[PDB]
Amino acid sequence: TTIMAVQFDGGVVLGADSRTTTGSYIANRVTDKLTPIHDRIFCCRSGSAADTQAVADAVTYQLGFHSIELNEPPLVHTAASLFKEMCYRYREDLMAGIIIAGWDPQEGGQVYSVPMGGMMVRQSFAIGGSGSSYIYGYVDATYREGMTKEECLQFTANALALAMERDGSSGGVIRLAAIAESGVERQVLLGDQIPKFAVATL
Amino acid sequence: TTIMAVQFDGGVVLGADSRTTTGSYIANRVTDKLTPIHDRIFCCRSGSAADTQAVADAVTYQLGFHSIELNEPPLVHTAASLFKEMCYRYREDLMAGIIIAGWDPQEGGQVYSVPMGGMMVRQSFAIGGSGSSYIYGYVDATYREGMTKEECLQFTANALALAMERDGSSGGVIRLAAIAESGVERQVLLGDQIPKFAVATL
Amino acid sequence: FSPYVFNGGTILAIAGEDFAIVASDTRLSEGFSIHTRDSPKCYKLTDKTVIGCSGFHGDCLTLTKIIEARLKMYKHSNNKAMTTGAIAAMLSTILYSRRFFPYYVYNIIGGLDEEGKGAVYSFDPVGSYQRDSFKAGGSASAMLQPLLDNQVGFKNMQNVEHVPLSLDRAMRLVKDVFISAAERDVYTGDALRICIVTKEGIREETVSLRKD
Amino acid sequence: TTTLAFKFRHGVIVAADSRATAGAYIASQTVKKVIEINPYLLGTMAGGAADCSFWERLLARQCRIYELRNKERISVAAASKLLANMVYQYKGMGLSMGTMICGWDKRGPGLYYVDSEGNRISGATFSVGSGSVYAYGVMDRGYSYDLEVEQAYDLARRAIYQATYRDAYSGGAVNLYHVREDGWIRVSSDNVADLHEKYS
Amino acid sequence: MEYLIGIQGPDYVLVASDRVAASNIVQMKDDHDKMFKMSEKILLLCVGEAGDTVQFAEYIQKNVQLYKMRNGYELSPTAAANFTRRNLADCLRSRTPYHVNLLLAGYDEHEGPALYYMDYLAALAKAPFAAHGYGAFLTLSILDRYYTPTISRERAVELLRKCLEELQKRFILNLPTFSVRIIDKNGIHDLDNISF
Amino acid sequence: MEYLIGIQGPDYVLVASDRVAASNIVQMKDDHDKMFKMSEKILLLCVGEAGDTVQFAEYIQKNVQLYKMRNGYELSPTAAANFTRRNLADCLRSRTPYHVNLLLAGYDEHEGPALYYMDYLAALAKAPFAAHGYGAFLTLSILDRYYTPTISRERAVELLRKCLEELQKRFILNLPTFSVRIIDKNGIHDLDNISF
Amino acid sequence: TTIAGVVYKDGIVLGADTRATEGMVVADKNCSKIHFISPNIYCCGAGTAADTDMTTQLISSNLELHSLSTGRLPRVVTANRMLKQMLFRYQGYIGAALVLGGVDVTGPHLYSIYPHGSTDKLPYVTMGSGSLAAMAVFEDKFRPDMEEEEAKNLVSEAIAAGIFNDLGSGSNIDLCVISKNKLDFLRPYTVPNKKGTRLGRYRCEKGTTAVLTEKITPLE
Amino acid sequence: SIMSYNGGAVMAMKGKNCVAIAADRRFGIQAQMVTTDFQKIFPMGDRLYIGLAGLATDVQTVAQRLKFRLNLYELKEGRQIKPYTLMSMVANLLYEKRFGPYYTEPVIAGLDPKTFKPFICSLDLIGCPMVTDDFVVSGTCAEQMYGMCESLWEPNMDPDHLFETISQAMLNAVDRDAVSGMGVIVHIIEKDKITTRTLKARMD
Amino acid sequence: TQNPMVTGTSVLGVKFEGGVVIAADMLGSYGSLARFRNISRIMRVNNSTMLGASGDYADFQYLKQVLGQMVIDEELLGDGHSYSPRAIHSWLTRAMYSRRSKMNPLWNTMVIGGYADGESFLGYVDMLGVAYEAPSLATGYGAYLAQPLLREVLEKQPVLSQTEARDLVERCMRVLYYRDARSYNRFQIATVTEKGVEIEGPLSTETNWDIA
Ligand SMILES: CC(C)C[C@@H](C=O)NC(=O)[C@H](CC(C)C)NC(=O)[C@H](CC(C)C)NC(=O)OCc1ccccc1
């Protein structure tokens, strides 16, 4: 599992692999790990499939009712807070690491990280999952301030491709999603579309 | 711990951090993990301090006696083989990951990786240790064929700097060694000399 | 690390007045998978002796090789082939020699005795053995034994003549018991190998079973 | 299993069932639990079938060697000590064995009980196995040193039969042995089913 | 372990039990009574874990007496036995199981004498004779050998003696005295203790 | 557990032991002898794990007899006690320790009577009286109450009977009969068993 | 056990074997593992037999109550959501691995529900001990928008591979074809394996058994 | 295993318009036999029987609780229960304790009250129904029972032949089981008569 | 090896008319980490025998060394006798069983393929000394994913041509890449025929559809 989210001026870019495993068996190789909580709000799921799905469904129900009551679009911070509240309270029962990214009029593109345990923190970019440990240096070395949407999409694609190459629990196809005021634009990189790095041969 | 070795046309470049820990306490913050096995053969030590020092001394004694018997410089492959025989035979008792890099007339600069369990394999570049897991993506992305000695030194310094930043068991100063036919040139990067990558600002 | 694994297998031996039958399924499995469908568990030892081994295939192969070596050693040092009774006694000592690391093997010897009559010997993993008239061992032993006792032993049947067992009737019994076992025991199937020991020699036959 | 033996005026009687079980599965019903060490000595089996059979056979081998060397038959006390010493080397290593050495030495009838736990005690009456407790009750209430030969046979058969009736892991047939001054004899082998009809 | 034994005859039930209350290799009492008077024609013999036996037996006794006081007639031995099994089985899976082994003996005018066997798992069985404790292993064979359905009460007491003598000769625990009682159409009669 | 007891008088040592050999719950033997004759004036009483007692006792017996045959005079009780302690202590930390509790009683021409106490840890001690087994917890107080250094052998047997009677009344295990022996300057004398 | 499902051009095709094992011995030789959820939805069950029966039966009853109240055909999404929410609530103690498939207003749908309460919506899924054997056939031969006959052959081959290569699967192959205007529930679709013909005769002649006591109690 | 604490064995079989249900009689605690007359087949109707094997306490508890429910159902509905409905009631009863189950594996045998159509079934300890057209077994010697039934059973058997087959299957199966046996009780259920027989069995 | 450290994934093998094919991906996994991605897990034992191994790679290298030296020793004699693939299979079985008995296993699952005297050989050896010969073999997850396809084809058609076997192996390797989470795209194919042993360079399953 590798989930990545980046923030740019006026929106955010989300990405994830498409592998779900039960031991060493790939039960689903095209899984969609980007769950739309609301319009312009997304969550990337990692950890236990059952727990993340249940938590995502509950927050979707809570946020939708909250938005209807207030007659205003939800805030990304509010969506992260709802994830934090449940993930923290049931920290002993849930195995779920989430990153909440989206756009709202008040604060623009935002990326929040909710790792296992239920802490919440705003980040310029976030990564998670089993495969995130293999790209900590890469994202730290190759990240820049002021990147555009296209640069963020390429940056996320390169990072995910490297993690899938190394991690055994990551693989399949790369699912991306750019969120801005205009809307949500999703795409899938598969086959030769995935960034490729030559393997050294002696 | 973070040990790295790169091969270029003419020689090899070795690098390592300088941290030794006993839990969360840094017993030695300027430790030298590059051990000269012979005149133009080095080893990078990772894992148990006692096990690696004991094995390194044993191989140094064996290789030196072997070189004296046959009036010729030793082969880097032979140095790796002696390390493999010891590490494989006592894999149950030893906890040591070794990178053997050096230069010999027959084959030039070579890098051999001997991880836990006694495996031996030749690689264009090798990494190992606790912090090596955090730079697998970076090295796979930034490595290019036919680098120069200067580029390899910069490549190794950047890779170690990232790992030391993200790993709690790695830190201190970067120790570099370049081995060629001319000789061995040892270097130490400390303070501002260590490569720096800016952090985000949310 | 567990040095043992159950590979399945069912063996059967019937002793007649002038013959002996040893039969076994030809399936080798591990866990829920099938390694192969053509591994008979009956090994010919001499011109008048056959042994059926089942359990841990690692031990089954080693034990058969050891028995084959020991049979040759006896012949060299005694100038005569071993008898069925001697083989059973030797095997008992061999099995007990590892009483603290036993062969996970169930053995059943079958052949002609010195008088020319069928003889069957059944063994435990540690060496204890008895001279029986018919026995079943392996995964489906519990299924095979009750019918053999009823039909060959005439147990629980009254006013029934105890006619001597015929070769044709024995062959039909062996086929029927294994067919029924295949329908219920997961570890037995594929095919059935039958070895018939007579004064003429050792004859072999094969009949298909269910493939699960 | 149930095995019993007792000394009376005309020798020592030895009896046992013929059942061997692998867990809850009856492996056999024709197991000979009495070993004929020599025409004047025999031993019983109780516990592990492999352990009892192997060590009794080893004892029989040792006894024959002793007879050949000393030109005189071994005594019951010596044979029991020989087995007790042999199995004591493996104490605590999981051997499961309980046996009775019965014979007629130069000192008259002899009966010893040897266990893998290291016990070795002489006595007048003994019973070993899972059905030992049941056999003890019938044997004790009916035993007398002055029993007639025919009476002794019936007491042994009845005691074994009752044990098989009450004990799940005991059954088959009752094998009965009589040891006299001129060697032992096999007196009878009666199936428990036949006995049940007679006693009922 | 304690000892209970019961022999049922054509028109009577003979029950006996040891009179020892031990506590870690010491006989604290030599005249302990393990029989409970359910009613004028029913006796409950209870052995097992300390506290559990008294609590369970007294609880059943209170209910059985209450039934008699409320309905004007006493419970039958069969109904009392099934009532006891129901309570024991119900508590079996609760947080407070009762670890007790029971023998219920009684006489009904219509059905006649009845002896019931019940272990701590609450499995109820009706038998001509039964025994509880480790001594049951040594004495049950004696009963099987010598018991007959038409045994007179004088012969039954003799057969009981043979069982108790076997315990003295072959059992390892010290059980010198045994309480003895008999139930028939006239009620519960206390016989002389069998002592050694 | 088997029971041993020893009382030392001015010119004699009185030792007694039970005569029971129990396998699990059945007394397999009722006339077992737990006393080993080391020499003409030394007795060794051994109780412990099955096999260990006989193997250790018989081994010590052979060595003491060998010493007598080699040198022409027998070992003193003190020398035999220390010799036994050495062998037990040496085997303690080995791979085949002996779990045996011992009582060594003997008479010396010069030193006089001696009673020695030795547990399975090979801790030797010399006491006027001692006991082994669970009965020791119950008889030792009686000895402390009624024992005097100048006790005659007739009063010693009476005191021994007191302790054995206490075992019958209050001990849980069935120990019907006991073996009694006395050592004085004339050797080892076998007194009549104290039975109940 | 091998249960599979494929989304073909018009609808769903579900497959399953007919073996149930207790321990290592065949208990039921003709177990029915395809469970009716609605007139347009069916569920294949793998795992604990009692759990799958109780879970599918409860959901089917709940959906029938839902269908009666709404007056419309049930949706596969509704069945999937109710199943996962129940299974998650029990934290995986219900050993029910399910293959849910059906056709509704929005078109064919195929889910795979796992005991812990996680679901995957995929064109083809497999479960049970023979799941890997079946998935090998699917990964080798599956094609989008297949014809009904081709889909049936594929699912039949996928179940057959599990039957012949897994010890926990055997007996016959059951199929259930669901489309917008049909539902073919082929219970014994194929019978790959059959018991051999008895060669001898062991009929027990009258009087072979010994009777102690007899009692006849006429009825009516 | 808990199911082997008391032993036990129950089998059911089908004939032409007749069903046979058989069981052993031994009741014991581990290796010790207590009685040889324990009841394991309980009547649930004129031609409907339930045979329970496993823990003796659970065998009695289930049979009593099932009768409690069955009596209420019949009175409420004013009709005789059908074999299929009895299975569903038993399966529901067993599954109510899916966590902490009753340690018994019932087998049901009977004829339909209207059509007199033979019916047999078996359930797991947590209530998994299983209908068969030939036979069902349950107990400690299931493997032995399967071997005898698979080789002896034939279709469309007369009541006389049905009794012989089930009796032989039961007798030889328990003869290879240590904790089962000590007599066999066989019920042959026909449209107009219920003949109960006790077989001459080994008592060892 | 009490605990393997770097391991290889499934190894396939299928025999055809006049040879045998073995395949294995070039990847050493350090417990869910693709650490070494360019290591060969196939060996050329001799002119008519090849070997592919799963499990610990360090143990495989040790066997590579021991087996390679032994082949050298035999060739030195120049006596006209060479180890047949069956003989190598027998030796490996004894070596693996002996280590198991010592409770120091060689954590490997080996597939042996060879062609001698006009007869294909394909053998299997496990960590515990379990060994057998089958028309097709697959270790690790290949026993679950790839073995069903190979067995299905072989049952339909017992005899395969070289092209058919190569295509079958390629399809199976594609399935393993799809489903096995410890597999790699690059892999090797080794073929043994009358002309010797040939190992194909690093191939790929680029024919990988990803219609999501
Ligand atoms: C759906 C993703 C957001 C989460 C996913 C990504 O790594 N998680 C997983 O793959 C984890 C991996 C690890 C906990 C063994 N697996 C799981 O959560 C479970 C296994 C349970 C026993 C916990 N895997 C499983 O069976 O997944 C079934 C599945 C298949 C497709 C979609 C959703 C769920």
Ligand SMILES: CC(C)C[C@@H](C=O)NC(=O)[C@H](CC(C)C)NC(=O)[C@H](CC(C)C)NC(=O)OCc1ccccc1
């Ligand atoms: C290559 C060398 C620099 C060794 C180095 C690698 O980076 N190893 C380490 O840093 C490992 C890390 C541990 C988590 C395994 N630590 C060690 O090897 C430490 C270092 C000593 C100086 C205390 N050794 C250790 O824990 O055993 C020595 C010891 C013995 C008794 C008490 C406390 C410490």
Ligand SMILES: CC(C)C[C@@H](C=O)NC(=O)[C@H](CC(C)C)NC(=O)[C@H](CC(C)C)NC(=O)OCc1ccccc1
């Ligand atoms: C002389 C023996 C047959 C006495 C008998 C009763 O205690 N032995 C047994 O019942 C033994 C031990 C049991 C008490 C746990 N049971 C057994 O099952 C053992 C083997 C297992 C321990 C693996 N023996 C066995 O299966 O019988 C093999 C056999 C078959 C025929 C003749 C002699 C021996």
Ligand SMILES: CC(C)C[C@@H](C=O)NC(=O)[C@H](CC(C)C)NC(=O)[C@H](CC(C)C)NC(=O)OCc1ccccc1
């Ligand atoms: C019947 C289908 C649902 C599939 C079938 C697979 O072969 N399921 C099964 O076989 C499952 C277990 C499985 C892990 C092997 N169990 C069963 O089928 C059997 C019932 C048969 C007699 C019909 N169940 C059983 O014995 O239950 C044991 C048990 C007890 C407590 C909790 C959970 C499970």
